Amino acid sequence: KIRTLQGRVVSDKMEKSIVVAIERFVKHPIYGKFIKRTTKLHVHDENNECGIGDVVEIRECRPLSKTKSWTLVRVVEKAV
Amino acid sequence: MVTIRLARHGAKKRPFYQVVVADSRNARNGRFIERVGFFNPIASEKEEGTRLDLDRIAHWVGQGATISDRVAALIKEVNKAA
Amino acid sequence: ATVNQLVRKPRARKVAKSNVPALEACPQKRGVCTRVYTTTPKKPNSALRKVCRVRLTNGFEVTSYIGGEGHNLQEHSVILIRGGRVKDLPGVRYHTVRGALDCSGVKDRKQARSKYGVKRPKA
Amino acid sequence: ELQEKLIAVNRVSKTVKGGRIFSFTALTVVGDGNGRVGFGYGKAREVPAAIQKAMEKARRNMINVALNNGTLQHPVKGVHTGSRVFMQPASEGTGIIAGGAMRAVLEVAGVHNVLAKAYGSTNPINVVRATIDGLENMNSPEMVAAKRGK
Amino acid sequence: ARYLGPKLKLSRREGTDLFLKSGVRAIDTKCKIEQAPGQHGARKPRLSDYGVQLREKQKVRRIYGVLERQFRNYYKEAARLKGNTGENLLALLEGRLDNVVYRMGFGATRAEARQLVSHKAIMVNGRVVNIASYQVSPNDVVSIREKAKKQSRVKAALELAEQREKPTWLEVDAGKMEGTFKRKPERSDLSADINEHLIVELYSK
Amino acid sequence: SMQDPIADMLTRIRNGQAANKAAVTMPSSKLKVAIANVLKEEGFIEDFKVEGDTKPELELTLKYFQGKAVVESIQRVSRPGLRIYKRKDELPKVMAGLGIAVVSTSKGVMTDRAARQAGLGGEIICYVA
RNA sequence: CCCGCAGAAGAAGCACCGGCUAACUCCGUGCCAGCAGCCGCGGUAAUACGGAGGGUGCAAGCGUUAAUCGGAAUUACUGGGCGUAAAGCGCACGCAGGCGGUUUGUUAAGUCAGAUGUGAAAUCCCCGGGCUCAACCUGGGAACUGCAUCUGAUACUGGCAA
């Protein structure tokens, strides 16, 4: 299959694009504590179906603008 | 061009050559794709002096690799067994 | 101490700077010895301690102790400063290498001879 | 087969009416060479009387240690006053490599090849007291299996 | 790079016969052993703990004729080898070629054996070895060449080989003047009085 | 508030051994009965008994060999502030094998010997020495 | 590299000796000259200064200086503390954060197990081999504690539902 990620929409307001925060849960190298850690990504969506506060899966593609090398596959869990 | 060639690694007045597969425009003792055998011109009169992986050499010559005069001489020395 | 508090702000021991700003941390430097002095020590000791004041080659003007019994330094006398504190004098941080550029070896010495710049007597 | 050795002698003082008065304290450890370790303090006005009181107190007040073949069994930590002490059996980890005043008690204790590292304070009067406490609460595989059934 | 001095002085600081002058006569008789290692030698030392460890290391080096960087390298090799580091260290000191030439009775002392080894009078396995610290493997044959065979020294040395204890890990045979280092010496096969835990602990501080 | 009931259980057992207490009661859970079954199995407690219907109460009958107490030192390793997950190679032995370390592996709550034999590591709960 | 020649013949210094720290006396100096890494020596009998005799440690080196780590558990993750030694905010409310009672079901993100790809070669480590040995060179392995993907396990933690 393809490698994909899941994350939540952190903001919405851009012209056929979105930005998604990813939560990786990584152990501290010295201290041995599992710490949450984000990764904000500028993600493309044609016809901008996902709004703010959603949860969306996301795959990597060719560059579509500056940063923006990521595009959604499936919007889940939109509940407001 | 990729070349199966020798690369000098022993001490002073005592060379040990390792036969590698390098992009030919690298340095001699520099970057190689894979090493594929060795050649000690002394070693002693014991057992080997030279072993050399003929399957990988045949693979690279199948790919288009060239072979220097020493490596050709060593393959002409270790023909199939001797 | 709580592991969260160290994730927020890690441990940090200070730098523990150098006693000898002979800059770059070079083993010796050379200087010009702007003047030559004798200086009285701190309280439990009493002597007159033979000490020069030196314009180094890196710009720093530092004062420097002169080891051994009797020297031949006078005011221009390019010397090779070494590094090493004399605790008994307030503010000398360096020594002069005896047996170096314009600093002769100690006259009539026989033991610990290498650290005073004196050659082996022929016998 | 008694194997006595002295660790520390000191000069303490008292400060009476007319000047000071100086006394000497020994600190010795005896032990047979197979468990059986004791320490004694002892203090007197001259040094040989001090060491003799120390030996005489150390020959009594002697404790059993459950040694292994020639060494400890499991790593053990003994603490006394300000003096924290680690030991590790070092299964033929050759030679007794301990701090001062711990080398002696481990030497006459009959152990041969442990690894130590005292921490904290390392006053000799309290670093033994932290080796015996230590070697005292170190128990053997026939004692743990005695406790917990098997 | 080697000692070159008064030998019995070194044997007199240690308090023990270091076998440094084995030679013609019997037990010392002109050493004043124990009495005075220098001018204040009549004084008892009251030696420290560092002093006993140090003095044990010096006993062993002054026996086998090794200096400190070489000895220290033997301690590193004995440490990394599997087993008991004291026993490994004595096994490394006993495999030295000058030592094996001394044990076989080819030299009267270890310095004389070291000069036999040094002056190309000794072959191992039919090849001449010039080096005092060559490490003799088990099942080797070390012998004297045709030059420096039937020279007086070695004969006299074999004469005083019978006065000593005939080591178990050798094939001493003096007829052909060749020997076989058969196995590594066990710790229980040598000397019984050196305390190698003291030199393990000396280097491990 | 209570945020580590396992360390609370081990605290009950340390302070029961230290007070020559005959038996120790506490609120019960699946993990505490799993650990308690490991402790009875390895010989550090005498018995356990879970009673109650709507509020279960685990009860550990403690052991005392001589006058001394059997549980010499019980420690909590994987606390909630910092959890400790060891592999089958990193999996420690306590008092050089004379003292078990209760590891929660995927196959269940086991000891260090039993889970190193089973070929799988996990979350190391407590050292019992 | 081998053989032959002549003759011990061409071939030993450097630091230290009060304690720490292995190794001691005499003479000169007399708060001076000077020593010193710290403690500190020297104001007339100085094992601390300068010399000598003696000894100790290293050795074609030996000392000093500079720099790093160690010792230093004196930044403590392993592995420290906070009544009085330095250290509990003057006290609360509370957002983000950290942590979260108990039972069942599902997931399997953390966690664990296995597999695959990769983690260059040299270097470190192990077992061998060649230079008379050693340093050195070298064969094979281990290792590179990682990351990614796939396959599973589901006790604990997390997500979801009750």
Added chain:
RNA sequence: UAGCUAGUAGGUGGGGUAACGGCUCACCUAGGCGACGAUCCCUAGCUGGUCUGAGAGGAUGACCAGCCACACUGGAACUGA
């Protein structure tokens, strides 16, 4: 050093490149980054490794090898795979 950013963030279309792309231009939207530390300032080639350490770490990155950058200083292209 708490705000930084207007080709700036995104979109549509044209151009450009070997190739995606604000790479460039016109128009439209008003975004984007930031206390998980942006922006500014000081320092610095990076790594395999080296030194020390029981270890975890700490320091460092001379030789050897991989990558980057530079070629008196600042800029530009031409030829050419």
